[PDB]
Ligand binder design. Structure first.
Ligand code: EQU
Ligand code: EQU
Lengths: 123, 123
């Protein structure tokens, strides 16, 4: 059913772990089949598991970690701060992001909005 | 005009400083006259400076501090992680929150959503 605040904290924490290890198939399965992703917030959203999978395969030697607790509400939504470290054309980079997610009645990610821009990038 | 990503970072950081010192009038002036506030996200929103001022006067010996960088987008929005420490009936408490704000063309807060619940409270 619609995840409780405690369940949202668990789901979002699991999401980061999956991103960290890079299990693309497991990441995609956490999304609803018709989920929408806005990354970064402000740019046109991608829709559906096919587009989401393509996005992650292209994006993910990457490391991800929570940098603070998951903030969860009682209506199936949560927000979390985390950092992503990768390599861009050789040089190591870090990106600080905040994701806001809305889950559906099946415990799957319905909508995801990623807040970040160049000001949160470090090379 | 619509604040740039760098400007959003500055405005949101200033907001926390105002909350920390507790300057109610200065806090209210950062909001648009008809701004809406959802605190915590999930509960009915309050509307207008009068209601917002009443909310802050009731809410603010409180300390507030950013616990990570402000994540800003290019369309006048930002998200930030912070902690609020206060006293509840004698016992000291801490609350971890994430605010998402949308600014208008005048650089004022149009909409604010605060993500938190009992799971983010520490007594
Ligand atoms: C999509 C994402 C936010 C942005 C992002 C991720 C991973 C690799 C990236 C590589 C980039 O060059 C730019 C942005 C990202 C995260 C994976 C989990 C998440 O929330
Ligand atoms: C409104 C707020 C989030 C919640 C909150 C604040 C201040 C005092 C509080 C006292 C409470 O007993 C419960 C919640 C708050 C913050 C002031 C700045 C902000 O974003």
């Amino acid at each position: 059913n619609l995840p409780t605040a405690q369940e949202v904290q668990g789901l979002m924490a699991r999401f980061i772990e999956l991103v960290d290890v890079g299990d693309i198939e497991a990441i995609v399965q956490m999304y609803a089949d018709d989920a929408t992703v806005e990354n970064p917030f402000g740019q046109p959203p991608i829709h559906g598991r096919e587009q989401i999978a393509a996005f992650y395969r292209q994006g993910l030697k990457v490391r991800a970690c929570l940098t603070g607790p998951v903030r969860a509400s009682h209506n199936g939504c949560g927000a979390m701060p985390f950092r992503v470290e990768m390599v861009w054309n050789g040089q190591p980079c870090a990106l600080d992001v905040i994701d806001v997610m809305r889950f559906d009645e099946h415990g799957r990610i319905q909508t995801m909005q990623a807040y970040w821009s160049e000001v949160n990038l470090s090379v």
